[PDB]
Amino acid sequence: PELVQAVQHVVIGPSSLIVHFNEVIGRGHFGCVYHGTLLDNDGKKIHCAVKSLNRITDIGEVSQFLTEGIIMKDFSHPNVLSLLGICLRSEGSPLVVLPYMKHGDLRNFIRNETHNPTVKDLIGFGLQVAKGMKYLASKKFVHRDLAARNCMLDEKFTVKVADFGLARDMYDKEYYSVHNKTGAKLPVKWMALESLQTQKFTTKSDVWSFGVLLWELMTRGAPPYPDVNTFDITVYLLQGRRLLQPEYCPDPLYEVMLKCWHPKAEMRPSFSELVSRISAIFSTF
Numbered sequence: 001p002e003l004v005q006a007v008q009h010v011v012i013g014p015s016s017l018i019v020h021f022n023e024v025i026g027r028g029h030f031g032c033v034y035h036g037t038l039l040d041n042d043g044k045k046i047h048c049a050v051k052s053l054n055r056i057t058d059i060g061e062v063s064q065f066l067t068e069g070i071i072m073k074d075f076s077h078p079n080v081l082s083l084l085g086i087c088l089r090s091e092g093s094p095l096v097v098l099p100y101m102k103h104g105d106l107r108n109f110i111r112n113e114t115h116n117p118t119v120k121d122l123i124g125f126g127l128q129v130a131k132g133m134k135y136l137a138s139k140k141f142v143h144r145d146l147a148a149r150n151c152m153l154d155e156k157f158t159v160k161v162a163d164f165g166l167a168r169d170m171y172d173k174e175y176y177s178v179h180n181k182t183g184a185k186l187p188v189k190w191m192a193l194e195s196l197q198t199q200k201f202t203t204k205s206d207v208w209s210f211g212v213l214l215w216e217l218m219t220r221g222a223p224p225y226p227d228v229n230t231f232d233i234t235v236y237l238l239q240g241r242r243l244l245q246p247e248y249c250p251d252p253l254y255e256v257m258l259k260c261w262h263p264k265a266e267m268r269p270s271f272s273e274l275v276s277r278i279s280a281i282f283s284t285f
C-alpha cells in the first residue's frame with residue numbers, strides 16, 4: 001500500500017507459509033529467526049527460515065528497510081544467500097522467508113568440539129566465501145559486516161555469504177559497538193583501520209574483514225585480539241602489529257591474510273585475486 005509495490009514478484013500468501021514460533025534458531029535486534037514450512041510454487045514442501053521484523057514499528061522506517069534490501073532478489077550465486085520471498089499479513093510486520101541452512105552459522109559449526117573439519121575443509125570454506133564476495137563486488141555491493149558468524153552452511157557443505165539485504169541484523173551483540181550520534185553498529189575487531197577512523201566502508205574494507213575471517217577459520221572460531229581492548233585496537237594497528245599466525249596455518253595462507261591488512265586500502269588485493277590465490281593453495285600441498 002506504499003509507493004513501489006514491485007514486491008509482488010516475491011509475495012508469499014500467508015496460507016502458504018507455516019511459522020513454527022516455538023523454535024527459535026536466531027535472535028536479532030529487529031526480530032527472531034524461526035523454523036518454517038513453505039509450499040513452493042510447484043506445490044512441494046521445503047524447509048525454510050522465517051525472519052521477523054516485529055521490533056521495527058514505523059511505516060516509514062519499515063519502508064526504508066524493505067526498499068534497501070529488496071535488491072537481494074536479483075542476486076544469484078551458489079555462495080550467496082538468496083531470498084525465497086516475503087509474507088505480508090494484516091497482523092503486523094513483514095516476514096522474510098529464506099532457505100534453511102542445516103548447520104547454521106559458519107563460526108558455531110567450527111567451534112563445536114564434536115565436529116572434525118580437516119585443514120583442507122577450513123581452507124575450502126574460505127575459498128567459498130571469497131567466491132561469494134567476488135560476486136557481490138562485481139555488482140558494486142559493499143557488505144560492511146563480513147565475519148564467520150554471518151556466513152551460513154547448508155546440507156551439502158555449501159557456504160552462503162549472509163547477513164545482508166533483508167537479512168541484515170545484529171545476531172551477536174557481544175562484538176558490536178553502537179555509535180553515539182549516528183547510531184551505527186560497528187564490529188570493532190573486524191573493521192579496517194581507515195573505517196575505525198572515518199566510519200566509511202568500501203570493498204577494500206570488506207577485504208580487510210575477509211582476512212579476519214580467514215584467521216577465524218584457521219583457529220576454528222577463536223575471538224580476534226583477545227588481549228587488546230576496544231580502545232587500544234586502533235593504536236595497535238597503527239603500530240603495524242597484526243594478528244599472529246595460527247599453529248596449523250600453512251605459510252602461503254598467512255601471507256594472504258597479511259596482504260588483506262595492508263595500511264593502504266588501495267594496496268590490498270581484490271576478491272578476484274583472492275579467488276586465484278586461495279584456489280592454488282587448495283589444490284596442492
Ligand SMILES: O=C1NCCCCn2cc(cn2)-c2cnc3ccc(cc3c2)CCn2nc(ccc2=O)-c2ccc1c(C(F)(F)F)c2
Pocket residue numbers: 025026027033049051098099100101102103104105107108149150151152162163164167168171172
Ligand atoms: O545463534 C546463532 N547460532 C547458534 C547455533 C545455530 C542454530 N541454528 C541456526 C540455524 C539452524 N540452527 C539457521 C538455519 N537457517 C538459517 C537460514 C537463514 C538465516 C538464519 C538461519 C539460521 C538468516 C539470518 N542470519 N542468521 C545468522 C547469520 C546471518 C543471517 O543472515 C545467524 C543465525 C543464527 C546464529 C547466528 C550467530 F552465530 F551469529 F549467533 C547468526
